[PDB]
Amino acid sequence: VNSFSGYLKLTDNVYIKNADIVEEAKKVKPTVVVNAANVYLKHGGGVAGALNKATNNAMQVESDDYIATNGPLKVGGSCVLSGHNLAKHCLHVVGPNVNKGEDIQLLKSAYENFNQHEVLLAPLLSAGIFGADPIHSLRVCVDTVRTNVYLAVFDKNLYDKLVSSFL
Numbered sequence: 001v002n003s004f005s006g007y008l009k010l011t012d013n014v015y016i017k018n019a020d021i022v023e024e025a026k027k028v029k030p031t032v033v034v035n036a037a038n039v040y041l042k043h044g045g046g047v048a049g050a051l052n053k054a055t056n057n058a059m060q061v062e063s064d065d066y067i068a069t070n071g072p073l074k075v076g077g078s079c080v081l082s083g084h085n086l087a088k089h090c091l092h093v094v095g096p097n098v099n100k101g102e103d104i105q106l107l108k109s110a111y112e113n114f115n116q117h118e119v120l121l122a123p124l125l126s127a128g129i130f131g132a133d134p135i136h137s138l139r140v141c142v143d144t145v146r147t148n149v150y151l152a153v154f155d156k157n158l159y160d161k162l163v164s165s166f167l
């Protein structure tokens with residue numbers, strides 16, 4: 001039993017809700033919240049910009065030191081950093097950004113990072129401003145992640161379409 005509430009169960013291990021991931025994190029304080037990161041951990045907009053704002057920019061400060069020490073992530077890769085006031089940990093995962101021409105096959109590799117964590121609160125990778133089809137992202141999520149994932153979808157219209165079209 002865990003504290004995630006109001007989710008629709010899609011599969012054995014994947015759950016979905018129309019929710020603002022920021023507000024969901026602040027309420028649940030999950031062990032792991034997933035950030036829709038880029039390789040530079042520049043958290044400007046989309047999910048990343050919203051998460052970082054909720055930490056009063058502490059996520060960005062921590063991220064800049066991480067990059068100064070380690071260099072950029074790989075597309076499809078991840079790193080674990082602090083969850084600040086939102087979660088114990090933040091798993092920063094880089095899905096491919098279609099508006100940069102990145103190979104969409106890298107989406108499966110990106111979701112594989114989730115399997116290193118037993119339970120996660122997450123957005124749909126590569127959705128939103130990353131330009132991929134969120135229906136496809138949900139399919140890859142279901143077919144790749146074996147651990148327990150609670151997906152927060154900000155847009156109600158999209159949420160209803162994702163549920164109604166789910167196979």
Ligand SMILES: C[C@@H](CSc1nnc2[nH]cnn12)c1ccccc1
Pocket residue numbers: 046047123124127128129134152153154155158
């Ligand atoms: C408006 C955007 C969804 S914005 C959103 N909702 N949840 C999340 N997570 C990350 N971005 N995001 C959209 C709708 C329908 C087709 C494509 C794109």
